[PDB]
């Protein structure tokens, strides 16, 4: 019997804090953010990976386009990104301030995406 | 989970430095 174990299942809480801090040490110029497909996202495809490294000098317009590039998102269809599970950030806000405004207790950043403006 | 190495776990953003 199959079992699709997400990143948090294959990496215990200890391994998670250790991974985040080690990432902050080796890649101090990158922010560890989780990009997960919404549980009801049926139209849009699943992201190839979940752990991303974004430079603090960028904005969401760019991050959105990077995901659109590899996910090969359609032009006739649109989507939104919810931070920690809430869509309240503007596309022009720098990820540096967004990171410290949404930082989790383990120090990781969570993000979920879907093709809908309201859940 | 005996064997374990630094697999591709994180995916950095594409930019121009």
UniProtKB/Swiss-Prot annotation, chain A:
Gene Ontology process terms (BP): autophagosome assembly; autophagosome maturation; autophagy; cellular response to nitrogen starvation; cellular response to starvation; macroautophagy; mitophagy
SUPFAM superfamilies: Ubiquitin-like
Cross-referenced InterPro entries: Atg8-like, Ubiquitin-like_domsf
Membrane topology: Lipid-anchor
Tissue localization of expression: Most abundant in heart, brain, skeletal muscle and testis. Little expression observed in liver.
Lipoprotein listed as a keyword: yes
Cross-referenced CDD domains: Ubl_ATG8_MAP1LC3B
GO function term, MF aspect, one: ceramide binding
Outcome of mutating residue 27 to A: Decreased interaction with Legionella effector RavZ
Impact upon substituting residue 27 to Y: Increased interaction with WDFY3/ALFY, no effect on SQSTM1-binding
Gene Ontology cellular component annotations, sorted alphabetically: autophagosome; autophagosome membrane; axoneme; cytoplasmic vesicle; cytosol; endomembrane system; microtubule; mitochondrial membrane
Keywords (A to Z) from UniProt: Autophagy, Cytoplasm, Cytoplasmic vesicle, Cytoskeleton, Lipoprotein, Membrane, Microtubule, Mitochondrion, Phosphoprotein, Ubl conjugation, Ubl conjugation pathway
The UniProt record lists the keyword Membrane: yes
PTM section of the record: The precursor molecule is cleaved by ATG4 (ATG4A, ATG4B, ATG4C or ATG4D) to expose the glycine at the C-terminus and form the cytosolic form, LC3-I. The processed form is then activated by APG7L/ATG7, transferred to ATG3 and conjugated to phosphatidylethanolamine (PE) phospholipid to form the membrane-bound form, LC3-II. During non-canonical autophagy, the processed form is conjugated to phosphatidylserine (PS) phospholipid. ATG4 proteins also mediate the delipidation of PE-conjugated forms.
Subcellular localization, as worded in the UniProt entry: Cytoplasmic vesicle, Autophagosome membrane; Endomembrane system; Mitochondrion membrane; Cytoplasm, Cytoskeleton
Described function: Ubiquitin-like modifier involved in formation of autophagosomal vacuoles (autophagosomes). Plays a role in mitophagy which contributes to regulate mitochondrial quantity and quality by eliminating the mitochondria to a basal level to fulfill cellular energy requirements and preventing excess ROS production.
Family: Belongs to the ATG8 family.
Protein's name in the database: Microtubule-associated protein 1 light chain 3 beta
GN (gene name): MAP1LC3B
UniProtKB/Swiss-Prot annotation, chain B:
Sequence motif: LIR, positions: 8-13
Domain of life: Eukaryota
Protein name, as recorded: Optineurin
Primary gene name: OPTN
Associated pathology: Glaucoma 1, open angle, E: A form of primary open angle glaucoma (POAG). POAG is characterized by a specific pattern of optic nerve and visual field defects. The angle of the anterior chamber of the eye is open, and usually the intraocular pressure is increased. However, glaucoma can occur at any intraocular pressure. The disease is generally asymptomatic until the late stages, by which time significant and irreversible optic nerve damage has already taken place.
Result for mutant: residue 10 to A: Abolishes interaction with MAP1LC3A and GABARAPL1, no effect on binding to linear ubiquitin
Cell location: Cytoplasm, Perinuclear region; Golgi apparatus; Golgi apparatus, trans-Golgi network; Cytoplasmic vesicle, Autophagosome
PTM comment: Phosphorylated by TBK1, leading to restrict bacterial proliferation in case of infection. Phosphorylation is induced by phorbol esters and decreases its half-time.
Free-text tissue specificity from the UniProt record: Present in aqueous humor of the eye (at protein level). Expressed in the trabecular meshwork (at protein level). Expressed in nonpigmented ciliary epithelium (at protein level). Expressed at high levels in skeletal muscle, also detected in heart, brain, pancreas, kidney, placenta and liver. Expressed in dermal fibroblasts (at protein level).
Full protein: residues contained: 169 to 185 of 577
């Amino acid at each position: 019997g199959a079992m699709g174990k997400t990143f948090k299942q294959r990496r215990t809480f200890e391994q998670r804090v250790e991974d985040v801090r080690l990432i902050r040490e080796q890649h101090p110029t990158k922010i560890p953010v989780i990009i997960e497909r919404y549980k009801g996202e049926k139209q849009l495809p699943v992201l190839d990976k979940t752990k991303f490294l974004v430079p603090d000098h960028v904005n969401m317009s760019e991050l959105i386009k990077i995901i659109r590039r590899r996910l090969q998102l359609n032009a006739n269809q649109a989507f939104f990104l919810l931070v920690n599970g809430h869509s309240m950030v503007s596309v022009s806000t720098p990820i540096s301030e967004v990171y410290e405004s949404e930082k989790d207790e383990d120090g990781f950043l969570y993000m979920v995406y879907a093709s809908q403006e309201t859940f | 989970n005996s064997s374990g190495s630094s697999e591709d776990s994180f995916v950095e953003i594409r930019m121009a430095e």
